[PDB]
From a paper:
Microneme protein 2 ([name]) and [name] ([name]) play crucial roles in the gliding motility and host cell invasion of [name]. [name] contains a von Willebrand factor type A (VWA) domain and six tandem thrombospondin type 1 repeat (TSR) domains in its ectodomain.
The TSR6–[name] complex structure was solved using the [name] crystal structure as a search template, and the TSR6 domain was manually built. Like other TSR domains, TSR6 in the complex has three parallel strands, with a stack of aromatic and basic residues forming π-cation bonds on the layered side, although the number of stacked residues in the layer is lesser in TSR6 than in typical TSR domains. Notably, a presumably layered residue, Tyr-602, adopts a conformation out of the layer, and a water molecule is positioned within the layer and hydrogen bonds to TSR6 residues Thr-601 and Pro-635. The complex structure reveals that the rod-like TSR6 domain binds through its non-layered side onto the hydrophobic face of the [name] β-domain. At the center of the binding interface, Lys-72 of [name] forms a hydrogen bond interaction with both His-620 and the main-chains of Ala-621 and Thr-636. Remarkably, the H620A mutant decreased binding by >5000-fold, showing that His-620 is a hotspot in the binding interface.
Author numbering:
A (entry chain A): 44 to 91, 98 to 128, 135 to 228
B (entry chain B): 596 to 644
Amino acid sequence: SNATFLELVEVPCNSVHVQGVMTPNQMVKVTGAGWDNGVLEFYVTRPTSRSHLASIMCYSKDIDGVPSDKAGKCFLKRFEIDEKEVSLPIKSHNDAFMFVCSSNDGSALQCDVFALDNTNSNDGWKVNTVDLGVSVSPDLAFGLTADGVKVKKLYASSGLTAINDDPSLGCKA
Amino acid sequence: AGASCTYVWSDWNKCVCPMGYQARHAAVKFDYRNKPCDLPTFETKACSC
């Protein structure tokens, strides 16, 4: 492991590529203070290049042009298997957000999704747990695909090993 | 003003058994012009199991 006691290690790259399996009680974390435009997509990929495994897509309620049947809603895409709406606290690109994903028992992959209203920051975070409908497997990768994510930060708990020196993943040289 | 570079803490999650610890999360709101935000964004504490 990478620490005597559990801590979250910042990943100096554009995504978190876990080496090995997602051990129970370990987690990967992605945070941001908001984003600029378009949809916010939190994605999970697996080997075999690589392929998408699951994606959470959140549409802002504060962006002109977003269809009314999508505005302020989040959707879970699985691979494609299907797409379905999920109840998450992220409503706007002006919201701060946190994704904390883990395996509850070595099989199911789940994420705690947090949202904070930047106009009422003293009110704290609202949280919902969403099951990603997929099972964990070796060498999963986590990241964001969005336009202008503000103060994007990535973490991996110290019992996990994430790639931190690959320039192909945007890792700082 | 002295704004905090981290957002406020989330709630503590459910106690993890039988290891006996729970965790809570924060996030960086901004980095300083001269240094990265140095306030904690992750904390653990012992709980009864």
